[PDB]
Symmetry: C3
Subunit: 627 residues, 3 copies
């Protein structure tokens, strides 16, 4: 018969004038439909965005379907007898180009991610015909890209492609990775080749043939870096050999976007197989009506015998004209023995520069980190998270100094704003390279008042207040410089050899409780002027050997009524209430002059205000004022 056009609002309504289509493996098809109708005003809104189908009759009475969605439709002017319409038919994945999103996918395989993207927007017409197993991705971001671009690039990276299967009421995206996903349509497992010389030929056949070969790179070598295994040899290479000349030129790329050698080997295989796919393509013009992109057929009857083989259709163009029926298609084919892989055509997203994010973690915690000192962050574009420990992957944090179990360390805490950079601009590879203050997380010292201070201030955890901190600060204000050292709890200074302290002016030391000072050998102390001691309790000096007391002028020992005075000239004055002098052996009292007993020569010697307990305690307590 002809080809029939069925759509919502009526099957009888639209008559196909001409159709021109393009199909390609792992790509959206396009069907340009020129149509007529007796109705000069079919409402475009009523068929736009809705499905439309083409029914082409095959040998045997069965029909081939061209099903898709009307992405665009037009009313073109005409004279009285017929009215002109045009429609473009695209597959349902094209509707994913109408929607864009920033989203993070975690701990899923690419097929799992793709299916989720499909099912979320309520799409169901698809099939998994994948044979290989696909790695689970730790972190995979859809960033600033339409959902279609997102799934497409993922398929391109993992070596997944699709073809469409058209039924009367639905068309189905088939996910594929091997020869076993493709089939031959009934009555078209083997088509023949007949030269155009005959005039008319009865059966569906091919009438033109071409084969073309291009020089392609012979190998792809990939490389990457896993910080958890810095010494690992992650270099991988995949080779494809051709018999012709100049078939040995090598490709190299970094990074290969993998962490496990097995994954990289596959990725390298995919990319080179995809490049190699276009080394030998056969083009066949024909009236073959059953064969479409994704279909397997065999060629028979061509002069060059080796060419009579099984082909995989990678691309097809179509032309159908009707007078009110002739069908012709040009096919792009490769040997079915060859392995098809998609070229990286859909653009990969790239974060042009660094952005800021918020350090996140579990409900309870203040700090959330791991063995490598990483943190989890929440991005500003993420709308589908809970700002918890599940917001992102573990991200590495740059430091001031990093070495082998030594260096600097300041772990980003929950709630703080960090600067996140992206390795090679890859949104799937974040790394933290900065810390910034904002309106809530404010600067330590009041600015611009304290522009001259410099420093590090900490914060106790968990449950600290602005009073609980460990710091070091350097004041630069000229003539008011100062270095401050705060230990909220205990402070421990430890010097393995010689410690020096040089203070230009005064030193003021105050211990609230007990001080213990031990010297392992000799201790020497020199005071250029006055030395003073005040003890509010009891003093005890204990020397194992010899104790010496020297004075240039005078030595006094005063205690209440007891007064003892030794002078430089040799005068010795001892006063008290009563005195007792005893010796077990002999006692000698000698004078070069007279020795007087109760003559009146010796009287009470002045205490000069010293030795009074009340006064001394007053002087001591004066050093320790109450708050």
């Amino acid at each position: 018969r002809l080809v029939q056009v069925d759509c919502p609002l009526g099957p009888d309504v639209l008559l196909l004038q001409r159709m021109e289509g393009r199909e390609e493996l792992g790509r959206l098809f396009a069907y340009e439909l020129h149509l007529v109708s007796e109705n000069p005003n079919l409402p475009l809104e009523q068929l736009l965005g809705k499905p439309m189908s083409l029914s082409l009759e095959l040998p045997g009475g069965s029909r081939r379907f061209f099903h898709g969605i009307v992405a665009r439709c037009s009313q073109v002017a005409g004279h009285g007898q017929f009215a002109g319409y045009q429609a473009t038919l695209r597959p349902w994945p094209w509707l994913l180009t109408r929607t864009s999103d920033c989203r993070i996918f975690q701990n899923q395989s690419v097929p799992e991610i793709i299916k989720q993207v499909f099912r979320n927007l309520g799409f169901s017409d698809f099939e998994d015909a994948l044979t290989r197993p696909y790695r689970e991705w730790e972190y995979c971001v859809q960033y600033r890209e339409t959902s279609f671009d997102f799934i497409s690039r993922l398929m391109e990276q993992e070596g997944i492609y699709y073809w469409f299967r058209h039924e009367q009421k639905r068309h189905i995206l088939v996910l594929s990775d091997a020869y076993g996903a493709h089939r031959s349509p009934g009555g078209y497992a083997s088509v023949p080749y007949y030269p155009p010389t005959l005039g008319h030929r009865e059966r569906d056949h091919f009438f033109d043939w071409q084969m073309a070969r291009e020089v392609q790179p012979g190998s792809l070598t990939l490389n990457d870096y896993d910080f958890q295994r810095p010494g690992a040899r992650l270099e991988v290479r995949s080779n494809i050999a051709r018999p012709h000349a100049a078939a040995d030129y090598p490709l190299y790329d970094y990074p290969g976007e993998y962490v496990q050698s097995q994954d990289g080997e596959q990725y390298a295989r995919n990319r080179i197989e995809a490049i190699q796919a276009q080394h030998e393509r056969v083009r066949l013009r024909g009236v073959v009506r059953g064969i479409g992109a994704g279909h397997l057929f065999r060629l028979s009857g061509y002069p060059r015998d080796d060419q009579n083989r099984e082909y995989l259709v990678v691309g097809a163009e179509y032309r159908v004209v009707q007078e009110l029926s002739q069908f012709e298609s040009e096919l792009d084919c490769i040997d079915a023995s060859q392995s098809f892989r998609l070229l990286p055509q859909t653009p990969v997203p790239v974060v042009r520069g660094p952005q800021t994010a918020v350090v996140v973690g579990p409900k309870g915690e203040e700090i959330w980190t791991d063995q490598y000192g990483r943190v989890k962050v929440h991005f500003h574009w993420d709308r589908h998270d809970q700002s918890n420990e599940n917001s992102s992957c573990w991200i590495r944090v740059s430091q001031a100094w990093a070495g082998k179990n030594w260096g600097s360390m300041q772990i980003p805490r929950i709630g703080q704003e960090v600067i996140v950079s992206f390795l090679e601009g890859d949104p799937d590879r974040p790394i933290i390279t900065g810390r910034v203050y904002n309106a809530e997380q404010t600067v330590p010292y009041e600015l611009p008042a304290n522009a001259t201070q410099s420093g590090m201030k900490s914060r106790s955890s968990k449950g600290g207040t602005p009073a609980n901190f460990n710091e070091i600060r350097m004041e630069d204000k000229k003539g008011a410089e100062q270095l401050y050292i705060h230990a909220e709890r205990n402070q421990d200074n430890l010097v393995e050899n010689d410690a020096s302290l040089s203070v230009g002016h005064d030193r003021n030391k105050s211990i609230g409780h007990d001080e213990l000072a031990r010297i392992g050998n000799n201790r020497t102390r020199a005071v250029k002027l006055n030395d003073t001691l005040l003890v509010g309790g009891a003093k005890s000096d204990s020397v194992t050997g010899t104790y010496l007391i020297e004075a240039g002028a005078q030595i006094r020992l005063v205690c209440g009524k007891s007064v003892v005075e030794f002078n430089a000239d040799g005068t010795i004055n001892i006063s008290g209430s009563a005195f007792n002098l005893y010796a077990s052996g002999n006692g000698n009292i000698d004078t070069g002059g007279r020795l007087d007993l109760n003559s009146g020569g010796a009287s009470e010697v002045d205490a000069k205000g010293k030795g009074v307990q009340g006064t001394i305690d007053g002087q001591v307590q004066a050093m320790f004022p109450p708050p």
Copy 2:
């Protein structure tokens, strides 16, 4: 008549053979002119870069003008009778493509910036017809882009577009954002539609019609982050509703390049309206001579009655042929009720990586900062600044550790080189992420001699010298390690609990003036070997309670000629010039052996060189050498 060609050097000189033109809203037009002249050598240099005009006669005797600048012109070979020339006509903004510049615009609206760019290069033929008010930009950079791309990109972002109005002597760029900026040419407020079937038609009319609808996204959602308002909800959404299917797919983007919710809402409106603009496009072919891109007309007489409406011409193509006159235009139109907005076609500039810049500020200061610890910088590509406080906007500085009123802080000072990064690569979003030393701002410690040292060194401000600094340094040289702590002014160490000091070898303490040491409770000091004290002035020990002095071998108190000696065996030796022993009560002198008075038993006991004031002071001053 026909169409006439007027240019510098003569109106009679050039005759239009054929013309083909392109016009589009908010885009530069292009007019391809094939022309002949009797003169076989019009000098190309004489008409190139100067304006050229086309005068097409309208009904009513009035004329339509096609005015522009000759961007390129050619002398083509010809036959004897006439010589052929061709020129391409573009509007004057095209000359902005001849010039490129890096420049910073501060505190102006986009229209203001557009006008400034225009007036600077001496262009005046333009018109402001904007109805809405446009936000003032704090910071807006023209970076590595032609002036045209710069102005075009801003218009596209703010929903501004332009059309041209052609006079005999000038053509004028009209800035537009609404229906009110467009007009209808005289005699063309209403054009009729006549089918081409009729044969020949007298009046200017349309003879072909098409309307087309395409599926477009139904919403755009934008988002951004303002550090001055970290908690703010800046997410915005803009909807356009269509009656057809699949019209509700949503778009999302970040950042929206805004800080105020209201402005972002506008930005979301502009971008979605631009997307929606291409949902319903009408194409009209005609012999209509008055209608041009930017013009409003009405259609009359078309079969589909609703289509007889007011249209805005978004794009026009032209074909004019003359024999030695026929005029044809194809029009791209939208409903005038719809709001036209430009698509983001002109590329936005992006700083691919980080650059370095110099911190600037007012003449007097050494440090210039604000409440958020920001600094102002001078870029190396900026030629139109003064390297002062007006060079740039306030830029945030990354730190080692940043939290809520705690963390690290080191403010970049004026004159220093910093590393500036750009958020999402946006030149309008700078952020400082690094500090680098250079040939002038040199490293603190001499390298590579002191590669082993580590540290932070400060600088007093203002008016500091290399002598004025607070630092901490760590020497790593093996066997020569050292930690240095410098306080140029005062040093304050504060420990809330227990302080420990452990020194493996010697400790050397030196105070230039007074030391005061207070212990809140008990003080215990132990010396494993020898204890020595030297006092150059007067010593005073004051105990409130009991003072004990014990020694294993001997206790000596010597002071000049007075000598007192207590021995372990029990010998007690007192020497002096004179001695006075007095008691108010009773005095007892007892000996288990004999008591001898002036027998000769007691003699002067040796001072052993001690107690001489000159010697003592000498020992003290030895500890405090000059200068």
Copy 3:
């Protein structure tokens, strides 16, 4: 006769039907060859990537050859008397597109680099005819770019262009920078012009002529920054003047990718001349057979006399058909007085974001750096280095704080992982913007157990162990806070004015050897309660002036059997074995009460367990336990 084709396996085999060619200066040719053969199965593999030659004979019997390689070959189907084949002919440089690699070139000129790339993949057919001298480059990256793109970008950046000269057996890439590598083909130094009006002409001539003039920028201004000369004025400008209007609009760009003004002057000059190159294009259609791009010809016999000049072929288009020969070329030309420079067309490599690297150095050292504190780092994409001091160029390291001979400093050491960022995305401008820990170079404190600690830990060099380090750490754990200060060797603290120490609870000081403490003026020590002293050796106090000892309750001096006791009430008790009291002058013993001699009033006074050498030493040694 005609055009003959010689290729591998037989020249008689391939007979050229038609061909179309495209040639252009500084770009590889494309030659489309349709062909017939009596053999309907020439195998493509025998010819593909092999060289192919086309011989068109000149006047005089001499021959023109088009030489090149077959990039692609197709067998088209046929009918009986012939068979159809097609070949594409490209030059050998094109095979560089089949090979890509990351690489770093060190201290070479661009020509030297290019020749290396040629010689390495073993190409020999090339020639240098450069007149100008080309600077050596410090560092030059080939990154994520095939070899062809790499060489061509460098050529475009240095204004080198190339052309082809074909021999029967070889084709040769000739590199040039001026009018002097150009030559004229034999018999074609001056061709003639004959108008088509004359009819048909036998001898090689031109029959169509056109000129083209466009509006181009009149100047290019470049700028850059050299940190080794921060004050340097590196702005450079290059002008080209034209007589027509609007010819003075200026271009500006940054960075100019230079450090020396002379280099930038040239680089600005090359890029302006290339823009300028396309301002006056002459196009001549022709039947002349010797003329090819790169070739200098002259023109005779054109009406416009000035146009009879010397021209440089910038491009040629080519068409030959043959029935079994008629030859036409269109040429694009520029005056020879002008100087061609290619367009910056092959895209530049661009590192979207930051990388990770390992610092390298000489075999012996631990740290390798320079006067500016720079380090040499080794990339992960590099495969041709030795991870030594030659891997990379000198790279600058960001710091926490950088000023004029002050600030922070922590030099990256060998082996450590750093973050490499790239100035304006340029792979030949890397700098360090981060330090990161990994699985080998691990965090200083064990995480996440010690997430609460904060700090800087050092490492002695050379030959340090985990025991050898200088650190500062801040414990934030609530209720267990601590600040730790480690000096592996000596510690030196220096305060120019007042030093303060405030300890809330206990202070514990321990010196392993000698402590020396000197006070420049007054020293005051106050103990609110009990004071204790323990000396294991000998104690010596020496006061220059007056020593006073006061007590509220009692003063005791005990030493073995000698016991001295002074009480508050005034009782004075002296006991011992024997006592000797001597005076040079008079001695007075007086009592207000009775004076008793051997009455029995005075007895031995209790030592109370004090003064025993063994006991005292026991107390002292208790303070100094053995390990």
